[PDB]
């Protein structure tokens, strides 16, 4: 017999240009915390397999992992509806999954196979899903993209919001400020999330770079603060008050020892695991066995993803333009013609 729900303290946010921030106390239901664990574990295991498929060279080109950051994508997806929008830079395996796609299609696009979510045309950086505007290879390019998805929101008035993410590397992009200004100016429901997984900036207070836009600093290893500060920021935006910065302080696992003392004293899966255990929300065996289901999940997908045939050559030209009649595309020399269908 397990509790149904418990109550924890989450760290308190720092504020900038805000009166009151998200509550320091929250409720985790049993059946919920069970769902957040299976998601965190899946993203973790997923990236582990990616990383392994990638020292083996089945995965070519870029391969950015987000293991260590699972509190971020799962907790964010905890705080928003499926009808809200999210767009990120290239570290997007976690978000592709929380936003709908299956570990099957994600791994198969990583190994560039026909079964992949973009038919193997995209690779690791460009994956799209229902309301997910992908990862974009160009640093900060997605922030004005996000501001625009936000503008569309207001434009249809459905009280949907936009999570527009960028890491601390991209926090000095000129475009970013160009979007802070318009966002405030047009009061766009855009939440500008800065993933700060820890020189380059003259100022490392990121939640404040917005300047005239209010921001909050959140702890990104606690799935609960993330969900909290997200529901808070969603609230704020939907109430028509315009844009907000939210610095998610986090840590990507990929000296290699600073990487260590940050894992025992705060994997973000271990934290949620200890909470559930210490408050009778779940048993250590329950969780240990969800791992076994997740590990077998990822194993079968990975298997499909290395077996799956490459796309056919004759489709190299497809999907250039949308809704057009078929046409030909020139290849390496003029005698090479590739059909292109929308």
């Amino acid at each position: 017999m397990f509790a149904n729900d418990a109550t924890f303290e989450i760290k308190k946010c720092d504020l900038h240009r805000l009166e009151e921030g998200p509550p320091v106390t929250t409720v985790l239901t049993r059946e919920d915390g069970l769902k957040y664990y299976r998601m965190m574990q899946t993203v973790r295991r997923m990236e582990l397999k990616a990383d392994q498929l990638y020292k083996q060279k089945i995965i070519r080109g870029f391969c950015h992992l987000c293991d260590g950051q699972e509190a971020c994508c799962v907790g964010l997806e905890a705080g928003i509806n499926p009808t809200d929008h999210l767009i990120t830079a290239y570290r997007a395996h976690g978000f592709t999954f929380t936003r709908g796609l299956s570990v099957r299609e994600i791994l198969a696009e990583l190994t560039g196979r026909k079964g992949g979510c973009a038919k193997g045309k995209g690779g690791s950086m460009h994956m799209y899903a229902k309301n997910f505007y992908g990862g974009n290879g160009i640093v900060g390019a997605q922030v004005p993209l996000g501001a625009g998805i936000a503008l569309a929101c207001k434009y249809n008035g459905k009280d949907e919001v936009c999570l527009t993410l960028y890491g601390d590397g991209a926090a000095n992009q000129g475009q970013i400020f160009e979007a802070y200004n318009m966002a405030a100016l047009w009061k766009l429901p855009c939440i500008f999330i800065c993933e700060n997984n820890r020189r380059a900036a003259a100022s490392t207070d990121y939640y404040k770079r917005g300047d005239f836009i209010p921001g909050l600093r959140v702890d990104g290893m606690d799935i609960l603060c993330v969900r909290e500060a997200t529901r808070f920021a969603a609230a704020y935006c939907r109430s028509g008050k315009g844009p907000i910065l939210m610095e998610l302080q986090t840590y990507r696992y990929h000296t290699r020892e600073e990487i260590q003392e940050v894992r025992s004293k705060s994997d973000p899966i271990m934290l949620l695991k200890d909470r559930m255990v210490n408050s009778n929300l779940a048993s250590v065996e329950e969780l240990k066995e969800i791992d076994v289901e997740v590990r077998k999940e990822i194993e079968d997908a990975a298997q499909f993803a290395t077996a799956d045939p490459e796309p056919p050559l004759e489709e190299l030209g497809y999907h250039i333009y949308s809704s057009d009649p078929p046409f030909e595309v020139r290849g390496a020399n003029q005698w090479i013609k590739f059909k292109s269908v929308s």
Partner: protein
Amino acid sequence: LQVTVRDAINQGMDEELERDEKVFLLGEEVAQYDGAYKVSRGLWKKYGDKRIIDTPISEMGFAGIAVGAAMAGLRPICEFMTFNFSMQAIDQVINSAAKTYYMSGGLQPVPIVFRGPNGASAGVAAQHSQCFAAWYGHCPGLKVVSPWNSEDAKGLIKSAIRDNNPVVVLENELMYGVPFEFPPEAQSKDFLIPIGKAKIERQGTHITVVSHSRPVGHCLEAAAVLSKEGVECEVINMRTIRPMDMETIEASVMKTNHLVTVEGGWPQFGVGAEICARIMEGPAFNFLDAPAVRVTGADVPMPYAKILEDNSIPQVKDIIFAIKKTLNI
């Protein structure tokens, strides 16, 4: 009826904006000011804040914001004061807009339109004078059209709004106040000029003259001078830069046996180069009785003084000199 190129475009957006509430205009000074070149005159007054949006001077930003809206599902007409300014946003156009449908294996289309004056004006000096036809037309996933006269302008602007992919429209500012005869079939709010097709603005049998934008006008001037000595030019208005209508140019070269391209901007790796390269690769190479040549802008950044600038853009003199050089007459 007579309508200036400026008005033809303004009609086009007006019919589009009415027909579809997904459609919206944004750029600098497009709204309250009536347009930097009065191209959106009265649109803000009629459709409001929501639909006609004055932006700050933040090109990389608003181009970004436009492309975003298009991805989320709106149909933004994103105006650049002039295309020299788009160089700051060129990356949102090439990398966010133009390659996205394809990277997503057909999952995510980007119904944006980018428009503004392009190429040379009058005494704006080097940083405002540049032609971009060749740079854009170079990129898969884009469509690039370059209207000349009123009728072109209203057709290709409606076509592009209705198109579902990113389409860059290269207007010409010196064309804006030129009035043209406006056939009644053009005033129709069902007017559409299909992208990818050229127009033959003058049948002829001696030489083929191909050109796009303002200098199409000057080829019609050179052709009237010339048929006073019985040289008949075939003048082709390209209209689309990508994907160009090379068939048409080939048909005509098979008839005339000669070819001249007149383009506005710089010579090297320019629009002429591509028609010329194609012409050699294609079937019509063997109908060519003399080498095809190119008439371009002079190969320097654009200078200020009137006489210097007057010799930096092709003039009717140079089109004729070239044609005669080709026809070896």
